[PDB]
Every structure is written in C-alpha cells, then in structure tokens.
C-alpha cells in the first residue's frame, strides 16, 4: 500500500468514481482492478 498512501491515496474501488479527477490518478499500488484517490471525496 505504500506508493498509494504516498499520493495520499487511501485505496478505493473503480465503481466509487472519485471526482473531481486528477487526485484519483489511475492506480499506484492497490489491488489490480481497484484505484486510488487522495483521502477526500465524500
């Protein structure tokens, strides 16, 4: 989980859709299918 948490990325499912974008990058170091955004959307 390190690289994820580096970008503040908590680890979230693609289905969650973190918006607004940029902070949700794509994937760092999550499960191969999940994504990450900086800890902050809702």
CATH of the domain at 7: 2.20.20.10
The technique by which this structure was obtained is NMR
Which phi-psi region, left, alpha or beta, contains residue 40 (left: φ > 0; alpha: ψ -120 to 50)? Answer: left
Cβ-based burial of 23 (10 A; exposed 0-12, middle 13-18, buried ≥19) = middle
**Containing structural domain, residue 17:** 1-42
- After which residues is the backbone of the chain broken at C–N > 2.5 Å? none
- Total domain count for the chain? 1
Cβ-based burial of 10 (10 A; exposed 0-12, middle 13-18, buried ≥19) = middle
């Amino acid at each position: 989980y390190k690289q994820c948490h580096k970008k503040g990325g908590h680890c979230f499912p693609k289905e969650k859709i973190c918006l607004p974008p940029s902070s949700d990058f794509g994937k760092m170091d999550c499960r191969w299918r999940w994504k990450c955004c900086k800890k902050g959307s809702g």
